[PDB]
Structures are given as structure tokens and as C-alpha cells.
Design an enzyme around this catalytic site. Structure first.
Site, mmCIF file in Angstrom:
data_model
loop_
_atom_site.group_PDB
_atom_site.id
_atom_site.type_symbol
_atom_site.label_atom_id
_atom_site.label_comp_id
_atom_site.label_asym_id
_atom_site.label_seq_id
_atom_site.Cartn_x
_atom_site.Cartn_y
_atom_site.Cartn_z
ATOM 1 N N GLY G 63 0.820 -1.193 0.000
ATOM 2 C CA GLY G 63 0.000 0.000 0.000
ATOM 3 C C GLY G 63 0.856 1.245 0.000
ATOM 4 N N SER G 92 5.187 -6.011 -2.130
ATOM 5 C CA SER G 92 5.572 -4.597 -2.197
ATOM 6 C C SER G 92 5.933 -4.115 -0.792
ATOM 7 C CB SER G 92 4.432 -3.857 -2.913
ATOM 8 O OG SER G 92 4.832 -2.545 -3.274
ATOM 9 N N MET G 93 5.305 -3.060 -0.255
ATOM 10 C CA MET G 93 5.617 -2.614 1.110
ATOM 11 C C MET G 93 5.390 -3.710 2.144
ATOM 12 S SD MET G 93 7.151 0.200 1.634
ATOM 13 C CE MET G 93 6.968 1.140 3.144
ATOM 14 N N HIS G 117 8.624 -5.351 -5.963
ATOM 15 C CA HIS G 117 8.558 -4.556 -7.187
ATOM 16 C C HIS G 117 8.899 -3.113 -6.825
ATOM 17 C CE1 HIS G 117 3.943 -3.365 -7.023
ATOM 18 N NE2 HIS G 117 4.643 -2.830 -6.038
ATOM 19 N N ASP G 166 7.220 -6.796 -11.526
ATOM 20 C CA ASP G 166 6.734 -7.676 -10.464
ATOM 21 C C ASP G 166 7.577 -8.946 -10.402
ATOM 22 O OD1 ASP G 166 4.729 -5.820 -10.037
ATOM 23 O OD2 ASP G 166 3.082 -7.228 -10.406
#
Ligand code: Z53
Ligand code: Z53
Ligand code: Z53
Ligand code: Z53
Ligand code: Z53
Ligand code: Z53
Ligand code: Z53
Ligand code: Z53
Ligand code: MG
Ligand code: MG
Ligand code: MG
Ligand code: MG
Ligand code: MG
Ligand code: MG
Lengths: 192, 184, 189, 186, 184, 188, 187, 193
Positions: G63, G92-93, G117, G166
Site C-alpha cells: 500500500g 511490495s511494502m 517490485h 513484479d
């Protein structure tokens, strides 16, 4: 969203939402657009506080863009009816009916914090339909404006003609300018 | 889709060749611009022959209606008016504006008169200006309706306070038209 | 549907043949582009004969109105202006811009004057640029209206602060038009 | 809004003006507008490569690439292309106003000229945003230099003067070098 | 809005088609491709020897529609010159490079952009697989032909089109997408 | 969504933090958020007018007048109000970060601080546009003056540095004078 | 509806019950609300006991980058070790925060999915505004990649290459990569 | 509204069932649902690491990763997790049904079981589509491998049998190896003797 404060008593824990905690100390929040719901709550809080103690001051916090004129007058007339002084303090902004109510606090007890914003302007409305219906609506909002200006004149010391000129368009005032105007009595400076 | 008659004309342009103009829709600026241009053209074609204005209209914009009104009174030819179907509000105002003695309705046509409609939103002073304007517009309409019908201004005001439907015969007795045109 | 007259012309093209141009809608760039091209064409056909600008318009874009305004002043022929129905805002500005002595309204036409409208969104500096621009545009409009009417710039400013409706007769006394046009001379036989 | 017909033969009004080598840039500049204008320019050149062409400009600007379609066609052909601002010329519109044949760039006295930097957007990964930023910065440099060359102003002055919307009167546009003359009424 | 007429009366584009100029001036879909290839076939029938001129101001679009134009160009006899005016991106730049050798042009400020094809797939895993294989194979076909027409290796085209790659007209010439920048 | 903790001598986690004089400014600033925070400040001052208060800031900013409601209440009361930026403080959020008690304004190392000029709008008559323009320009002068006083930067530098979005690392925010200390983690 | 457990008698929703045993849930997209809750929980648990481990459950698609760094900086600030365990997915995060747990105490369950990513964003407006947004997101990516390098042992250039698009990793691949220390196998 | 049942403690009906180690998987599987179920599993293990847990399954499936959160937590903890299909178990729901403790996977006679391949999407550049396609294909291989281990069916048979929606009766799901027993109703005599 609204935090709870919990304080220790001799019989356990006492929990309040923050605004009800302030109401225990005779502080009422006018912190939203003025509609009928907001006015009904405020006038009920005033009536309750007068019944608890008809001598102690009440404190009306005002951070409001204004709203319904009749709703504002529900609050105005209840303030004038009850015995306790109702202090008003503008924090953040008081616009339109919000600034009218600011100016309606007990004389000598109308305040603003130094960077608070005050705005005065004329009432807003609308009308659709037949010519005669438009006329009735126009006559009504004009009479409402005259009523507002008259009371504002009495509360500020400004003439009705100057109020009319100064509210024709949006008129923004600093806290100091609102004091000079007669809308408040003092700009509250920070404690030591 | 509009049929063609045979020079080849769409039916409405063919009627315009015989000096007939159609006011057959809600009155907006486009409709008015077209009608007053047709009036100016017909005057140029012949400054003496009558013009025939067909009216089947619920009314619409008052200023657009006055564009038609002022052009009718300006030009040299008489403009006959005939209500077929309905003439309501500004439509019935224009019906009454035709050349005197030459305002007609067919027996089952519907005529309705009422006061102008409008609106205003914003500041009290803006509402006031809008109110003064539509009241003055109504006084202007009623005065002319008084002149064209023979009724007093006070009677027009009372009779247009709410929607007032008239039969063709009642429109004649009122003075909005001169004759109910019998078969056919 | 726009009727045809019989060469076959739609009615508005027929009027253009007699040097009559229609300003009968809200003023946008399309409308202005059409009108200024008609003005250029008519001047080329005859640089001496009058042109007639019919105005039934609530106004619209200021720059589009000034496209029409500047083209009228550029060309040699007198451009009469004739208000029928309504001329409001930029529409009444253009009514007042017709050849002097040749600005008309019919008796029940409505003339309305007011200040320009606009908007702005963004950063304080962007709001400032937009505000200074529309104020300067208003000064430009007021200056020209002052010259065309004989009224002072400050009177125009006061009189356009809000919607100001004028009868045709009041527009004449104001200097927006020269004459209320009377009905044509016709026989009574 | 119907376009009137004139008789001479019968033309819609814009086709009649095109017969006299007048081209209308009277709308937002998109690819459709640009394709039409460059085709009219190509056609007029073929009819006569010596006689001037007249580009009317009442436009708020629009696509930069579409604007450069018009720009490059103007510079390619032999005839001088006069430019006249009537109403408004903003952004790519004012860029094309400044691109007319030198000495033959005009505005009518109350026309509005506005210059500013190009606008765009980018969504996605950091690397995609970087590509879009580098591209629009390169486009701005390309525009500012041609404007510097056409106006006589330094590129740095163009850069500062287009950082935000900059409105100019016709007279100010002449003194800036965007046009050569304010066409006054006689 | 309206396309002007020039004087026999032609709309401007039909007049240009008269001199063997075809406009590719919009996003490429099947309708655009059908019109262009029909113009190509007609022009060949008019004269199988004279050059054809393809104007390109296009952001690209459908790959199959683009290959309709590509194959019809290669099929006919006349040379098809290509000239980039404004912008040529993606399938637009592919078709620019497909012009007759030595007759691919751009004007000095024209923009050329190359990138890989775009698409999508929704549903079951096996459906995603089929769509993925299809667009990868489609990318292979574009890259192979782009290699033959530019002189660049397939591996370089692949690397250089992985993300949006903007080229000036001069850079497009050095890359081999066009043959000359057309100077005033 | 929000967990509850119960001590025996029940709180949602934020009310538990308020018990230790910690206030959360963790959202866009509107009047509701400001009303809650200034009431919490008034309540904490009444509980103890000497102990510090801690204002957590993770906010993109929002309403300028609502932000000044918070600003003025901070300056009015007796306790020092510490500010700590965690996550982000942008626009009015960074203004309030800078308004914490001198020497007690903090950010964690990767917090993002952004300063810019106020945003607004106006639609209608030229005279209405003018009033709105004069108002937001005066609001910007007001913000810049106070930011000058709180940071030590000149008003002219603040004006230049807020013309467009200006992103600062926590350390850059310290050198700018928006905070006093970057709170760096313990060694292991 | 979230079930209640009862332990006088005291009632907890299941997540509040787990917090009583120093377990914090990161089970949704990371926005400011989620981050504010988690960092407040971290602060509370440190105050309860500054030495005992905290357990951060991670099932998240990532997010907001700033919201994630709010969680990152609070983890590093407090004294207790913060264990991280990926269950379901960490993208991601989310995978950045997974890699940010106390070293030796970053875990994933065998079928958990890890994805890395580059950050995503956007910009609209003037060229100069686009440039500001571009410089900002590039600096943010460099900051993320720097920390990921320190936490995994990979070179910065390898992180840049491996996050360009990704990149999906099994739990075992996340271990070899250095994103986690151990794959927690069933008993 | 969810009814309440009543030291003298009051529970909503699902929390009452959780007190007896019964967990409800009764909706589409998203992250929220998975987070709740794995937390209930962790809580129940901490209460008693030996006693069986009962996972009720009436679910159309949902997110594969959310399903694998549930799957890995089941395999991690010490207690056996019974699974019982009541109503329906489709896609990831039936995957979790087959994941119950061996010998303790059940369905009631009219329960519906459906297996199929995972669903997804991909948008953008060819290479981005390639990455998404390779990812979902590997995810399907991961699912098929575990289903093969849990059912005894070969990976190739699962692949073929999930290519399109495949509906199974409770008896057919037992024969497939997705469950161990169809829990049949007892007669009136069975219930009293
Ligand atoms: C003599 C006092 C009042 C003039 C009179 C009466 O007219 N009214 C109506 C009323 C209702 C009302 C309702 C909402 C808001 C404002 C109002 C209000 C404001 C101004 C004036 C009147 C009202 C109720 C009030 N009573 C009251 O105050 N009782 C004491 C306990 C009060 C407590 F604690 F319950 F709040 C009930 C007994 C009573 O005689 N009166
Ligand atoms: C003496 C006649 C008019 C008083 C006078 C003049 O003031 N006007 C303006 C005008 C424009 C207009 C425009 C649209 C609608 C209504 C009008 C209109 C209505 C009422 C009064 C005026 C107008 C145009 C008209 N002219 C006209 O009639 N020419 C002959 C051929 C006309 C034909 F065939 F083309 F239609 C052009 C020559 C001319 O002197 N005048
Ligand atoms: C007196 C000469 C003009 C100052 C000069 C010139 O500057 N312009 C630009 C122009 C273009 C334009 C375009 C649209 C609207 C307004 C305008 C306009 C309005 C005001 C001033 C200029 C324009 C075109 C005009 N030309 C023209 O009039 N040709 C004769 C045939 C005209 C006909 F019939 F086709 F209409 C082309 C030849 C020419 O020298 N000029
Ligand atoms: C000056 C000659 C050109 C260097 C050369 C050539 O490169 N092009 C491509 C082209 C196409 C195009 C298409 C649309 C818009 C702009 C353009 C354009 C603009 C600038 C430069 C080139 C183009 C077509 C042009 N031809 C042309 O002008 N034919 C005469 C009759 C033309 C008429 F009447 F039909 F318009 C066809 C024959 C020809 O040699 N050339
Ligand atoms: C060279 C001969 C062709 C191999 C063959 C044949 O296969 N096709 C199909 C066809 C249809 C088509 C349709 C649209 C676009 C592209 C195409 C196309 C493009 C490439 C190849 C084929 C096509 C039509 C073409 N014919 C043609 O060109 N006639 C002369 C008159 C042409 C004129 F003027 F009408 F355009 C009809 C006679 C004919 O044998 N053939
Ligand atoms: C002399 C002290 C205050 C200057 C004065 C007074 O002006 N105000 C108005 C006020 C209201 C308000 C409302 C919301 C937010 C900010 C404010 C606020 C912020 C700054 C300044 C004033 C306010 C209420 C306050 N009182 C208060 O603090 N009582 C103690 C218990 C408080 C507790 F616990 F209830 F919170 C009520 C008694 C009182 O004299 N005053
Ligand atoms: C070690 C002392 C702290 C560095 C310092 C201080 O800077 N802050 C601000 C802060 C606020 C905050 C707010 C939300 C989320 C994260 C934070 C946060 C995260 C990291 C660092 C700081 C914060 C509050 C904290 N205090 C606290 O921990 N009190 C004990 C009781 C805590 C309990 F139980 F209430 F949670 C209040 C007393 C205090 O000096 N400090
Ligand atoms: C079996 C021991 C665990 C391997 C280990 C550990 O890695 N984790 C992380 C974790 C968090 C988590 C969070 C949500 C859902 C699933 C999980 C989960 C599922 C599988 C594996 C790990 C987790 C928390 C767990 N702890 C726990 O069970 N405490 C006893 C009280 C439990 C009660 F009652 F509060 F639930 C905290 C103490 C502890 O060492 N561990
Ligand atoms: Mg009182
Ligand atoms: Mg007449
Ligand atoms: Mg003139
Ligand atoms: Mg040239
Ligand atoms: Mg303080
Ligand atoms: Mg730690």
C-alpha cells in the site's frame, strides 16, 4: 473516531467520550455546519446546564462555517433566554451564522484565539416557480437579512447601513479585526 | 421524417412558400430566431399579403416569445394567428398578438394562460433582483394582454394567478381570439 | 428544422445574401468564428453597404465576444446592431458596439448588463493569476462600454456589479442603443 | 450551430474563405484539427507557391504534437503564412501565432495571448514516471527555444515567463516579439 | 469540426487522394485500416507505377489493423512513401518504418515513439496462458520485421522497446525507422 | 478494526495512548479532526498543566482554518506539546509539526515532510474571484510569517521554497528548522 | 463479524486477544489508518515490556509507502525484537516490512507468497510539476532499495534489477534471497 | 441479526461455537476472512494443543493466497483440524476441505463440492502479461501438487479434472479422495439405541 477518557474514582473507572467530558465542565461544542440536528442538541445542552446551575458561566466553542439561519436563531434565542452567561470563543473559523452566534455571547465574554478566522456575509437561499412564489421567497429572505443585520447592529455597535454594506459580499476578518468590528471583546493571548 | 412534395419542398418549406409559418413546439431562442427570420423574409417577398402563423405550442422562453411578438408588430403584413391543438402560456400570448380580426382557434383547440415561471439561487440581494425582474416581466405581459384582449390589468392578474384553461369558445369571449373557425 | 426558400437556401443563408448576420445563441468560439467570417465575406462583397447584426443572445465567452468586436471595428462597412428578444452580458456589449447611430432594440427586447464570470482552482499563486486576469478583462470591457455609452467607467462598474435589466427605452437613455425601433410604415387599406 | 452558405457557386462560409487562401484555426488543437489544417496548407501551396496564406487563430491550444504538425508544415512550404490572433491565442495557439512569417504576424487590438508551459501526466512505476518526466521536459525545451528564436527573447526569459499562465495584451505580445503589429482599425 | 471543400467539388481529403495521398491521421482501428487499404488498392488500380504518399500522424492502435495496412503496402506495386507529421507512436511508428526504402521521412519536429504491444487477459489460468503466448508471439513478429526494416538486431529492438522510447526525427533516422529528415 | 486493551487497577488503543498524554493527528485535517484534537488538548491541560503532551503527526494536511484551531490551542495551553512526524507530514501537517514546543519537535529517520502553498478555489463574478484571491493570498502570508518565526528562515525564502511542492527528508527538515531532532534508532 | 473470546469475566474480539500475547496483525492493504494502529500497538507493547519479543503477522498486498515507513521506523525505534512471519502473501511494502523484522526472526510459512517490485505513483499537470513528482518517487525508490540491500545482503544494483517488474518468490526463494531467515516447516 | 445465547456469559452464536473449538468458514475467502480463521486456529491451539478443532466449510472459494494462509496455519498447528462440508465447498473452499486432518474430512449427504482451476487477470505490456501468466500457472501447479498429495489422484488427472468447473456429490468427493466420509443421518432407532 472520538476518543474516550477514563478517570479513576473511589468506586471504579469513569468513562466519557471527550465531548461529554467537556460538557461536564459546562463546555458546549458548536463545531460543525449549523443544521436543525446540531441546533437541537446545543439548545438542549444549554437547557440542561442552566438547570444544573443557573449562576455558573457556560462556554460555547465555535468552529463553524454557519448554516441554517432558523437553526442559528434556535441557538441564539436559547442563549438569550437562559440566566447563565454564555461565553463564546472562536477557534479555527466562524463564518456567517457562526459569526452571528459568536457576536451573541455575553458582553465582555466573546473571544477569539489569535489566528482564528471570522467571516460575515449576507444570507443565502433560493426560489423556483411562479413569479408570485419568487416574490414571497425574496420578501422572506430580505426580511430575514434585516432581522440579522438589526441584531448584529445592537451586538457590535455598527450601524445597520454599515452592516449591510460590509456583508454584501464575503468579508473575511482576522481575530483582531473582528474585535475592532465589535464581533468579539478580546483576542485571547497565550497563558504564561 | 418530413415528407417531400413536388421544385421539391419539405412540407414545411412548401407551406412557407404560401406565407404559412409554423410555431409548433416549445418556444426557445432557436425557434424564435427561425420564426422572426421567416417573418422578415415574407415581408420582403410581399409587404401587403397576409401571413399565417400556426400555433400548437406550450409556450417557453418569455424573451424568445417577445422576439416573435415584436417582429409581428414591426412588419407591414398582417399576421393571422390560428391555434390548433394547444396554445399555452407564451403560446397563448402570441395567439392574442395576431392581427385584430384575424386571430382564430379550431373548435377543440386548448388555450391556457398563467403567470411566468422562473427561479433564483444565491444571495438575498441576488434573489431580490431576480424577483423584481420576473415581477416586472409579468406586469409587462399583463399590460399587453390587457391591450390585446380588452380585459383590465387587474382581471388578467387574477385570471393568470394559477393555470387557467379555456375552450376555444371561452378564449373568444375572453378576447384572446376573434373567431372559432367552424368547418367548411 | 430550418426551412428552405427557393437556387435553394436555408433561411439564414438567405438573410446573409442581404447582408444580415445572426447572433442568436450563446457566444462561444464556434459562433464567433462563424460571425467574423461572415463579416469578412460581406466586407469583401461590398465595403460600403451596411451590415445588419441581429442579436438574440445571453452572452457567453468574453474572448469570443471580442473576436466579434474587433472584426466589427476592423472592417469598413457600418455594422448595425438590432436587439430582438434579449441581449445580455457579452450580448449587450456587442449591441453597444454597433455603428454609432445604428444600434437598435425593438420595444419589448430585454437588455441586461453585468460583470464577467469565471473561475479558478489551485495554488494561491494560480488563483492570483486568474483573479488579476479576470479583473483586467472587466476593466477592458468597462473602458470600452464607457466610450460607447458616454457613461463614466465608475458608473459602468457600479451598474454591472450585479445583474442589471434594462427596458429598450432605458437602454437608449443609458447609451447602449441609439433608437427603439418603431413599426414600419404600412398602409391601413 | 449551422454554418451558412454563400453564393459566388455555393460554398459553406469556411470553404469560401479557403478559396481566398484563408485557413481557420478556431478550436482546441487536436489531431483532427491539425490534419485538416496541414492538408489545407498543402493544397494552397500546390495552387500557388508564391501568394501569401492567411492563418486565423482563435484557439486555446491543445496537443503539442498536433501543434507541431501545423508548425512543421508552415515552415516546409514556400508561401508566407500570415498569422492573425482574433479573440484568443493560448498555449500551442500562441506558439503557432509566433510561428507565422516574420513581419506578417498580427493581432487585433483586444485579442488575448497567453503563454505557459506544456501540460501532461504519468501513472505507474517510478521508471515510467521518469520516462514521462524526461519526455515532457525535453518537449518544453524544444518549445522554449523555438519561441526564443521566433521572439528574440533569451530561452531563460521564455522559461521564467512560461512557468505559470502569462496573459498578454495584443500590444504586450508585440513588444514581447510574439507578433509584429497590432492591426488597428481605420 | 467541419472538413472544408475545394473546387468538381472535393472535401479536402478526397482532393488529396486525387493526388495519391492517403491520410493515416488517427488511432488505428479496423475501420481506419479498411479505408486505408481500400484506398491503396484503388490507387494501384489507377496507376501501378506512380508513388503513393502515406501521411502518418497516429498514436498507433490495433496491431492486426496495423498489419492490414502493412500487408497491403507490401502487396501492391507502387512505392508507398511514408511521412511522419506531428507524431507516430507504436503501430504508427511501425508503419512509418514500413515505407518504401529510401522514401521514409519525418519533418524536423515530428515525434516518433516505439514500445512493446499492450493487451490484456481475464479468466482461467489456461485462458491467461493462451493470451500471454499470443501477445508474446505478436511481439516477436513485430520485432522481427522491425529488425529487417531498420537494420537493428532483434535483441536491440527488444531492449529498446521494453518501455516507451521517444525519438526525435533525427534519432529516428539514425535508428533506421526513417531515411531522411525533410528540411524546409 | 481498532484493537482494545484492558488494564485492571477497556480502551481502544488510541484512548489508551491518550491516557499517557499522547494525541493522534493521523488523518487529513478537517474540522472534526481539529475539534477532537483541541478538546483532547484542553482535557490534558486540565489533568496536568505541567506535564508534556505528545502530538503524533501522520497527516497530508487539509483545512487551513482547522489546522489553525490546533495551532492556536497548542500555543494557548501551559504544557509543552511535543510533535513527532511518523510516516508523513505534508502542508498543514508540516506546519503543525513546526508548531511543537521549541526543542521538542521530532521526526523518525524515514518520515516524509512536505511544504507547499495553500490550495483553494473560487467561482463566479470577477468581484467574487477577487475576494477569494485576496483571502488565500493573505492566508499564505499568515502561514509564511509564522513558519518564518518557527524555523528561523526568512519570509522571502519560505515564499520561494513553498511555490511548488517541496519534499524534505527528516534530516533536511531538521536543517530547515521545521524540527529540532531526528530520532535515530538504538544501535542493535 | 469478528468472534469474541471470554476469559471477573472479560470479553475480547479475537484480534485484541492476540494483542494480549504481543501479536500484531498486518492483514490488509497498508494505508495511514492501518499504519497508525500498528505503530500505536507497537508503542503500547514496548511500554508493557521493553525486552520481550513482538510478533508481526503479515498478510498484505502492500500500500502506501509513507504508511509503510511509519511502521518501519517504529519497529526500528523500539527495544523489543519484532518478529515477522509471512502467512498468505507479502507484496511490495508488505514484503519490505517482512524483510524489516529482527534479524534471525523473519519467517514465512511454506506456501506463503512474497512479491517485490518498484513503487507506484502518478503525476498530472505542468512539466515542472511532473519533474518534482518524478524526482520524488525516484528518491523514494532509491531509499527503499538501499534498505532492502542492507536487510537482504544483496547489492543495490541487484535489488534495482530484481524489482524493475513484479517479481514473485516462493517462501524458499525469499529465504535464499535474504528477505527472510527461515521457512517455518510444519511439525 | 446474529442471535445471542446465555457463570452467566452471553455469546453471539458463532462465538459460542468457538468456545467448543468450532470455526466457521462460511463466506467467500478474502484476506479478512483468512486473518480471522488463522487467528482463531492460533487461539485454539494455545487453549489446548491436543484437542481436535472443527472447521465448518460453506464457501464458494475466493483468494488463493488467503486460502493458503488458512492452509499453512492448519498444517503448522499441532491439533487435528477436522473439515466438514455443509452446503457447498467450491474451488479454494474445496481445497481447504481436502486439507483437513486425514480420516477427519467429512461432508453431509447433500453438500456440493466443486473443483476448478484458479482465476485471475493480467493487463499491460506483453512482458507484464507474461509475468502474470507465469505466476498464475505456477500457482495452479502448486495447488495441483498439494491436491494430488491429499487425494491420491495424479497431478495430470487433477489438471484435467479442473480444466472446467467440475461438480461432485458428497459420495463422488469421497471417491475422489477430497473427503474421508459422507456423514449419513442416523435413523430414529439409531438415535435411541
Ligand atoms: C420555566 C422554564 C421553561 C421556560 C419551561 C419551558 O417552557 N420549557 C420549554 C422548553 C423546552 C426546551 C427543550 C429543549 C431545548 C430548549 C428548550 C427551551 C428553551 C427555552 C425555553 C423553553 C424551552 C421546558 C422547561 N423545563 C425545564 O427546563 N425543566 C428543567 C430541566 C431541564 C433539563 F435538565 F431536562 F434540561 C420543563 C419545565 C418548564 O417549565 N420549562
Ligand atoms: C427596412 C427593413 C429592416 C427594418 C432593416 C433592419 O433593421 N434589419 C434588421 C433586422 C434583422 C433581422 C434578422 C433576422 C430576423 C429579424 C430581423 C429583423 C426584424 C425586424 C426588424 C429588423 C430586423 C434588416 C432589414 N433588411 C431586410 O429586411 N432586407 C430585405 C430582405 C430580407 C430577407 F429576405 F433576407 F429576409 C436588411 C435591410 C434593412 O434595412 N433592414
Ligand atoms: C485587408 C486585408 C486583410 C487585413 C488581410 C488579413 O489580414 N486577413 C486575415 C484575416 C482573416 C480572417 C478570417 C476570418 C475572419 C476574420 C478574419 C480577419 C478579420 C480582420 C482582419 C484580418 C482577418 C485576411 C484578408 N483576406 C481577405 O479578406 N480576403 C478577401 C476575401 C474574403 C472572403 F470573402 F473570403 F471572406 C485575405 C487577403 C488579405 O490581405 N487579408
Ligand atoms: C512538396 C512535395 C512533397 C515534399 C511530397 C511529399 O512528401 N508529400 C507528403 C506529404 C503529405 C501530406 C499530406 C497531408 C498534409 C501534409 C502533407 C505533407 C506536408 C509536408 C510535406 C509532405 C507532405 C506529398 C506531396 N504531394 C503533393 O503535395 N502533391 C501536390 C498536390 C497536393 C494536393 F493538392 F492534393 F494537396 C504529393 C507529391 C509529392 O511529391 N509530395
Ligand atoms: C491484384 C488482384 C487481386 C490479387 C485480386 C484479389 O484477390 N482481390 C481481393 C482483395 C480485396 C481487397 C479489398 C479491400 C482492400 C484490399 C483488398 C486486397 C488487397 C490485396 C490483395 C487482394 C485484395 C481484389 C482484386 N481486384 C481488384 O483490385 N480490382 C481492381 C479494382 C480495384 C479498386 F479500384 F476497386 F480498388 C478485383 C480483381 C482481382 O482479381 N483482385
Ligand atoms: C480560563 C480557562 C479557559 C480560558 C476558559 C475558556 O475560555 N474556555 C473556552 C474554551 C473551550 C474549548 C473547547 C474545546 C477545545 C478548546 C477550547 C478552548 C481552548 C482554548 C481556550 C479556551 C477554550 C473553557 C475553559 N474551561 C475549561 O478548560 N475547564 C477545565 C476543564 C476542561 C475539560 F476537562 F473539560 F476539558 C471551562 C472553564 C474556563 O474558564 N475555560
Ligand atoms: C521513549 C519515550 C518516547 C520516545 C516519547 C515520545 O517521543 N513519544 C512520541 C511518540 C508517539 C507515538 C504515538 C503513536 C505511535 C507511536 C509513537 C511514537 C513512536 C516512536 C517514538 C515516539 C512516539 C511518546 C512516548 N510516550 C510513551 O511511550 N509513553 C508510554 C506509554 C505508551 C502507551 F502505552 F500509551 F502506548 C509518552 C512519553 C514519552 O516521552 N514518549
Ligand atoms: C507456535 C508458536 C509460534 C510459531 C510463534 C510465532 O511465530 N508466532 C507468529 C504467528 C502469529 C500469528 C498471528 C495470527 C494468526 C496466526 C499466526 C501464526 C501462525 C503460525 C505460526 C506463527 C504465527 C506467534 C506465536 N505466539 C503464540 O502463539 N502465542 C500464544 C497465544 C496465542 C493466542 F492465543 F493469542 F492466539 C506468540 C509466541 C510465539 O512464540 N509464537
Ligand atoms: Mg445567557
Ligand atoms: Mg404586423
Ligand atoms: Mg464597422
Ligand atoms: Mg512559410
Ligand atoms: Mg504549549
Ligand atoms: Mg525492534
Amino acid at each position: 473516531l472520538i476518543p474516550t477518557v477514563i478517570e479513576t474514582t473511589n468506586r471504579g473507572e469513569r468513562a466519557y467520550d471527550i465531548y461529554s467530558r467537556l460538557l461536564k465542565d459546562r463546555i458546549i461544542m458548536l463545531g460543525s455546519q449549523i443544521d436543525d440536528n446540531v441546533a437541537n442538541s446545543i439548545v438542549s445542552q444549554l437547557l440542561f446546564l442552566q438547570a444544573q446551575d443557573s449562576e455558573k458561566d457556560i462556554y460555547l466553542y465555535i468552529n463553524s462555517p454557519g448554516g441554517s439561519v432558523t437553526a442559528g436563531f434556535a441557538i441564539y434565542d436559547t442563549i438569550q433566554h437562559i440566566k447563565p452567561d454564555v461565553q463564546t470563543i472562536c477557534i479555527g473559523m466562524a463564518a456567517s451564522m457562526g459569526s452571528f452566534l459568536l457576536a451573541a455571547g455575553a458582553k465582555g465574554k466573546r473571544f477569539a484565539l489569535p489566528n482564528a478566522e471570522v467571516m460575515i456575509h449576507q444570507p443565502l437561499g433560493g426560489a423556483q416557480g411562479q413569479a408570485t412564489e419568487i416574490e414571497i421567497a425574496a420578501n422572506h429572505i430580505l426580511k430575514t437579512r434585516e432581522k440579522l443585520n438589526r441584531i448584529l447592529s445592537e451586538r457590535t455597535g455598527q450601524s445597520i447601513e454599515k452592516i449591510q454594506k460590509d456583508t454584501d459580499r464575503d468579508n473575511f476578518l482576522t481575530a483582531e479585526e473582528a474585535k475592532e468590528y465589535g464581533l468579539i471583546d478580546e483576542v485571547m493571548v497565550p497563558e504564561t
